[PDB]
Amino acid sequence: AEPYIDPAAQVHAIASIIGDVRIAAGVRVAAGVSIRADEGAPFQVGKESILQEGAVIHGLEYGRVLGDDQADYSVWIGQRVAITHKALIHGPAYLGDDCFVGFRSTVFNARVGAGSVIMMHALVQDVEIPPGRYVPSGAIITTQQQADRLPEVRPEDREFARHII
Amino acid sequence: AEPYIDPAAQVHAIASIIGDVRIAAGVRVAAGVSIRADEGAPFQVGKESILQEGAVIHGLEYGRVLGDDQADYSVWIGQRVAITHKALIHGPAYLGDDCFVGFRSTVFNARVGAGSVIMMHALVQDVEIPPGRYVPSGAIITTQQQADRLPEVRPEDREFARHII
Amino acid sequence: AEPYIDPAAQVHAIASIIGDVRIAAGVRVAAGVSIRADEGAPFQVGKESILQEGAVIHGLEYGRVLGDDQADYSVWIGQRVAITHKALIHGPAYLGDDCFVGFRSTVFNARVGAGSVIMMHALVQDVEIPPGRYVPSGAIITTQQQADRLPEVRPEDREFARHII
Ligand SMILES: [Cl-]
Ligand code: NI
Ligand code: NI
Ligand code: NI
C-alpha cells in the first residue's frame, strides 16, 4: 500500500510514486515521473534502473507476469533498465535486465528479454521479445510473428543506449 | 468561464479543468489530466466517460463541431467515451458515444462516429470516421479516402476496450 | 545556472525552466512546459517562439550545435519557432527561424533548416533537414538520404502552421 524506496535510490521530490512499488538501490527517478500501483500492483524496479521525465508506469487490475523471484507482478523492471523521456510501461509487463526503452516508446501486455534495445517512437504490445533483440525507431510490434523476426542488438546499439543515459 | 462539474462526476484533486467545460454525471478524470477551454470553448464530456493520466483536451480559438443538442462546441465527447493514457483530443473534435481512444492516440479536426475503436499510437486528423470503425495501432489517418476504407469494429475489439478501462 | 527570462517574454507561472536557458522577447511558454538545461546546456529560445502544453526541451551532457551567434548550444531554437502540444526537442538540436513542430513530434540530434514544417506524430533524428522542407504526419526520418529527399514547404503548409498557433 506504501512504496518501499531503498535508501540508496535517488527519487526526485516532484516524482509521484503511489501504492505497492518496490524501488531498489541505485534507481534514479527524474522529476515528472509517475509510478502508480493503484490499479495493477505490485511493481518491482530493479537495481540501477533509470526513469526519465514524462515516463509513466501503470498497470491493469488483472494480468500479471512472472518475476525472476517466481512471484507475480503487474510490472517487473529488471536491473539497469533505461526508461527514457515519455516512455509508457503498462502492466502486465516484464522488462529483463539491461533493456533500453527509447523516447516516447510503449511496452504493454508484453515480455521483453534481457539486453533488448527498443528505439524511439516504438510500440511493443501483446508479444514476447526474445533476449537481445533490436526494435527500430517507429516500429509497431503487435504480433508474435513480428517479435520472433526482430534482428539482434549490435555493440553499437548498446553504446547508443549508454550515451542516452 | 467556470467549469460545470456534475456532483456525480469523480474528478481527481490534481486534474486541471479550466474555462467553459461541462463534465456530466459519472465521468472519471484521473490525476494529471488537463482540460483547458481557454482558447477553443465550449467542451462537453458526456455521461460515464473516462479520462486517464496524461490525457489532454484542448481546442483552437476558431473551428466548431455540431453537438447532439444542435449547439456548437470546440470539443464534443459523447457518453461512455474512453480517452486513455497520453491521448490528445484537440478541437475542433467530435467523438460519438461508446468510442475508445487508445494509448498515445490523437484526434484533431475530426468527427469520430459512435462505437469506433481507435487503438494505440494512432493519429486521426482532418476526417470523418463513420460509426463503428476500427483504427489499428500505429495508423496515420489523414485523408477521407483512408477513413472511408477502415474496417468494422468486431465484438473482440469492444471486449478489449472494456478490459483496458 | 539561472535562466535569463526577457521581461517581454510571457512564461506561465506553472511552466518549469531550470539552468542556463535564455528566453528572448515575445516568447510564449504555456503551463505544463518543461525546459531543463540541468544536463545539456546552454539553451537559446529566440524571439516570438511559442511552446505549447506538454512540450519538453532537454539535452545530453555532451553534444552541441553551432548557434547563429557562432557560440555552442545544447539546443538552439530560432525566432518564431512553434513547438506544439507534446513535442520533444532534445539536444543536441538546432531549429532555424520560422520552423513548425507539430503535435507529439520529436527532434533529436538533428539540425532543422529555417522555414521547415514538421507535421504531427513525426520523428527527426540524426539528420540535417535543409531549409524549407516538409515532414509529413507519421514520418520517421532517421537517415540523411531520407532528409535530403523531403519535399518543399508550400504556402498552404505555412498557412496551416499559423492557424495552429
Ligand atoms: Cl506522447
Ligand atoms: Ni492505466
Ligand atoms: Ni492547443
Ligand atoms: Ni534527457
Author numbering:
A (entry chain A), B (entry chain A), C (entry chain A): 16 to 180
Please share text taken word for word from the publication where this structure appeared.
β-Carboxysome biogenesis is reliant on the protein CcmM as a central organizing scaffold. The full-length CcmM protein in Synechococcus elongatus PCC 7942 (Se7942) is a homotrimer of ~58-kDa subunits (SeM58). The N terminus of each M58 protomer consists of a γ-class carbonic anhydrase-like (γCAL) domain that has lost the functional motifs for CA activity, followed by three Rubisco small subunit-like (SSUL) modules connected by flexible linkers. The γCAL domains mediate M58 trimer formation.
The asymmetric unit of the crystal contained the protomer of γCAL181, while γCAL exists as a trimer in solution. Indeed, analysis using proteins, interfaces, structures and assemblies (PISA)48 indicated an extensive interface between subunits (4,180 Å2 buried at the interface from a total accessible surface of 18,860 Å2). Note that γCAL198 and γCAL181 are nevertheless trimeric in solution, suggesting that the head-to-head association occurs only at high protein concentrations within the condensate or crystal. To investigate the functional relevance of this interaction, we disrupted the salt bridges by either mutating R164 to aspartate or D172 to lysine. Strikingly, both R164D and D172K mutants strongly reduced homodemixing of M58, indicating that dimer-of-trimer formation via the γCAL domains provides critical valency, presumably by increasing the local concentration of SSUL modules.
